[PDB]
Design a protein around this ligand. Structure first.
Ligand code: 9FJ
Ligand code: NI
Ligand code: ZN
Length: 347
């Protein structure tokens, strides 16, 4: 029942060109409709819109640090170690991805591929061209430009000039079959934007922010070692947990598949994971709304090694609370079901 509640299930949205042109306000729109409570939403951009003319001219693009994803575990509980490989071009990455050893296996519908994924993730370790600095948007595209979204996350750079690779700048991800991202919320529990430029699909699991603590508790239970060492160990982005285990332990979750040309928005304190079906290319970065600031103040951070100083955000957007907050006496409690204040117009 908390399991099935559609107020917390993954929504898809199909904006007009008109509504698509204003990024930050469409985000408030989708929150006005409950998008946020799943932790993950799909936005299908209008059909005419193309961020780039052709993807035929990137064969020579360098993937500086491809990673080979070794996974270890059994009984739905795994740990992924990314081993660094020599630099290769996109062309050489495509070659390995499409070969007999690494290609997508044969399958009828998504559930079969899903079973193949969870059965074989420890075998035949694929290479993921992850975290490449760069963007495939053409210089001139003013709608949903992952390299320049212009949200209030940019306040750190206005005031200091300081950027953080991947959070304030764009990353590309060249996937092949079975390459994975572990269970995680974003750095500083930010929002994220992920756009599949081309190729085979990317499937995603998301846990609703209102139930995120349950996933932490499950993860503590089955990795107490990792949890002694570091209260926020999910932030290492190394832990995979199967849908069967989530179901079994009462963690509500939902699933969706992202196809070429679609955007996925992850929301504050939204745990997600997933894998690629086959050769593909996705771009992402982080962003913020006014709602994020409290998530930023309260984010439980890695206690054993990325950190945004919230002072500037509280100063600008929460001026009266600032002194009370620096005192350590600001016990604002987050309601994860609430839309951002920018949504108020859509009522
Ligand atoms: C520090 O350890 C890390 C950090 C980052 C990663 C990995 C390991 C595994 C490869 C994927 C990337 C993260 N990839 C994603 C994160 N969130 C949403 C989607 C993706 C994706 O891979 O498409
Ligand atoms: Ni993510
Ligand atoms: Zn840690």
């Amino acid at each position: 029942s908390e399991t099935l509640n559609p107020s917390a299930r993954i929504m898809t949205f199909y904006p007009t060109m008109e509504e698509f042109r204003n990024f930050s306000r469409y985000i408030a729109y989708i929150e006005s409709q409950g998008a946020h409570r799943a932790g993950l939403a799909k936005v299908v951009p209008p059909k005419e819109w193309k961020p780039r003319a052709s993807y035929d001219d990137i064969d020579d693009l360098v993937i500086p640090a491809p990673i080979q994803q070794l996974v270890t575990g059994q009984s739905g509980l795994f740990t992924q170690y990314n081993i660094q490989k020599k630099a290769m071009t996109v062309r050489e990455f495509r070659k390995i991805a499409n070969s007999d050893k690494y290609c997508t296996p044969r399958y009828s519908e998504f559930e079969e591929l899903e079973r193949k994924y969870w059965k074989n993730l420890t075998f035949n370790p694929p290479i993921y061209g992850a975290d490449v600095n760069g963007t495939l948007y053409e210089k001139h595209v003013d709608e949903w430009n992952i390299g320049r979204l212009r949200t209030i996350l940019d306040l750190v750079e206005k005031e200091s000039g300081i950027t953080i690779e991947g959070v304030n700048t764009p990353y590309l991800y060249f996937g092949m079959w079975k390459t994975s991202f572990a269970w995680h919320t974003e750095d500083m529990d930010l929002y994220s934007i992920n756009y599949l430029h081309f190729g085979e699909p990317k499937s995603w699991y998301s846990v609703p922010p209102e139930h995120g603590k349950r996933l932490e508790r499950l993860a503590k239970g089955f990795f107490p070692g990792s949890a002694q060492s570091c209260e926020a160990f999910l932030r290492h982005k190394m832990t995979l947990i199967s849908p069967l285990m989530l179901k079994k332990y009462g963690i509500p979750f939902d699933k969706v598949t992202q196809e070429a040309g679609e955007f996925m928005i992850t929301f504050p304190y939204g745990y997600h994971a997933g894998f690629n079906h086959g050769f593909n290319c996705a771009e992402s970065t982080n962003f913020a709304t006014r709602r994020w600031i409290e998530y930023g103040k309260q984010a439980v951070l890695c206690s054993c090694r990325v950190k945004i100083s919230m002072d500037v955000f509280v100063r600008k957007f929460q001026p009266e609370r600032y002194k009370l907050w620096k005192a350590g006496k600001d016990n604002t409690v987050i309601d994860h079901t609430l839309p951002t204040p920018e949504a108020a117009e859509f009522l």
